[PDB]
Design a protein around this ligand. Sequence first.
Ligand SMILES: Nc1ncnc2c1ncn2[C@@H]1O[C@H](COP(=O)(O)OP(=O)(O)O)[C@@H](O)[C@H]1O
Ligand SMILES: Nc1ncnc2c1ncn2[C@@H]1O[C@H](COP(=O)(O)OP(=O)(O)O)[C@@H](O)[C@H]1O
Ligand SMILES: O[C@@H]1[C@@H](O)[C@H](O)OC[C@H]1O
Ligand SMILES: [Mg+2]
Lengths: 297, 296
Amino acid sequence: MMIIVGVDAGGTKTKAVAYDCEGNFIGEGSSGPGNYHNVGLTRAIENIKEAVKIAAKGEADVVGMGVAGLDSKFDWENFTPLASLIAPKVIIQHDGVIALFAETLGEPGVVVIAGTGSVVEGYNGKEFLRVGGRGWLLSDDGSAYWVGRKALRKVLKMMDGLENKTILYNKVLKTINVKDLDELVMWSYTSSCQIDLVASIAKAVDEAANEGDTVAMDILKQGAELLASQAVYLARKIGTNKVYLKGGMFRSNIYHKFFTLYLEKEGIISDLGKRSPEIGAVILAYKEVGCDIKKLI
Amino acid sequence: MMIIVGVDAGGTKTKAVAYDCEGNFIGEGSSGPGNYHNVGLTRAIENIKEAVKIAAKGEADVVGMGVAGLDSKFDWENFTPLASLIAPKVIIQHDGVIALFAETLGEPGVVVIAGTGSVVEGYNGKEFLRVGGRGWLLSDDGSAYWVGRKALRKVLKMMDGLENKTILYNKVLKTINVKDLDELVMWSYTSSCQIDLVASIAKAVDEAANEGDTVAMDILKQGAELLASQAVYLARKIGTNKVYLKGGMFRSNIYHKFFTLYLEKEGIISDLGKRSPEIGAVILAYKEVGCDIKKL
Ligand SMILES: Nc1ncnc2c1ncn2[C@@H]1O[C@H](COP(=O)(O)OP(=O)(O)O)[C@@H](O)[C@H]1O
Ligand SMILES: Nc1ncnc2c1ncn2[C@@H]1O[C@H](COP(=O)(O)OP(=O)(O)O)[C@@H](O)[C@H]1O
Ligand SMILES: O[C@@H]1[C@@H](O)[C@H](O)OC[C@H]1O
Ligand SMILES: [Mg+2]
């Protein structure tokens, strides 16, 4: 026997699933962020190692992982060595790769990730191409963090009396446990660089949007179209008329709607896909150790 | 005979000037930052006492100070105690107040301060008002940080090939001494959560704009207009048709123009700051202790 573990290490959570080499599910586990840009190398590795240990219920023989944050030769150099310590055999890819291959099983295609951050990544069958996916300051259009920041800035303007307060106002304050501008200021001193925390506010935006807040809908719409525009670009670029949609942001029905309406308008078909990204990581591990992908899917 | 000192305690540095109650100059001194957020309460206080100490070299009777960093009640509770003991009589206000009074002479008015951050301060004769000025993440529309971020994001888009490269591209990359996408990425992750580095990019945007880059011009325009509209809101709430403009952002001719173009369209006139903040602090003190601002 042998224990194969697939891990999807993101900006909010790290998800791992463990299997046999015979397509038999053994377990699952989850932990905090695996994006070292968000929590530091020690925490990221520790979280990944924890999710793996949990899902495998001990030691794993092989671990395949898709990692958010591997956005430069630099990142790969800093992360690869340490991540390679978690199991005798470890395969490392960008998180966009495992998300796509979970669906295309390795074939050409384009996937859009809208989670804590965002990215549009595709495979030509020869090379991987990506647009965006370079961190919260430089990119991550339409990501949960993007949405969260937009929401926070709007609440402040409502607080300043520059705009009418809407449902969003209370939803957001509650989520971050703030009651007034004074607590918001203090909150900013301590929480401004907590990426997953800012991104968590996206849920509040969705809540408001579902309860009729047009201001929240507007935020979701702008973010969704900004990211979708990039998906259309890479789709034409690669030559495919279909893209897969993955990530926590797509849990927002409104976000998803605006995203697909924009894609449809551009002649692009969207698919939420069938499998989770960690399954794509297991697929990669299987290929690495010779286990048959057929028993898996 | 009284010794009145006005103090401008900014995040970068502190300046204090002394005068008697009859408007006669006594001296001045400078010192390190006054924003305890940038250098810890202990350091800020000692510096403030530094400038004040020399400005009037020795004891001071009254001290009016504009301080950067008191953006919340917590900040006030932290700073005020020690600050109020620097002189027998000490008046404390936001650095925006003295900047405003330096121009209005203590009368009602509105002033826009657009530098690394941005804010609109106003006084209606009875109480001080404010909009924005709440930090890089939540606020600071139209600040150097704000335009710097917009530029960075646009430069990545150009690299990804989502938009045509314009002169702005090279200007931002040269300013942050980056030549690679790999290099850009690592730069952002090192300078991510520290505002000064991002705000410095605003200079490259201005330079691009001056060289005809309409894409750069547009960033300045959207920033200036987002802030300008807050200025309009406060001007109308206070009841004045004019506002004063101060800050490094107004060193950009184009930003200034877009700002004025938008103000005028809204029936509001404006003028650049024509007096130091520390003088506005002396004015704040004068107003509090009954000294004639005209003699000043
Ligand atoms: N219904 C929803 N509407 C909007 N945002 C949501 C919703 N559900 C979850 N999210 C957001 O999506 C994020 C989680 O997405 P996820 O894909 O797991 O990210 P990552 O891969 O970076 O860990 C959180 O930041 C959360 O705020
Ligand atoms: N001509 C200009 N165009 C664009 N930005 C400028 C220009 N001159 C200065 N700046 C920017 O404005 C800031 C300086 O503002 P300043 O008023 O000195 O504020 P602070 O006291 O907070 O440093 C810097 O971030 C700088 O990049
Ligand atoms: O690597 C990408 C990261 O930079 C972004 O923040 O989130 C999405 C990831 O794919
Ligand atoms: Mg993810």
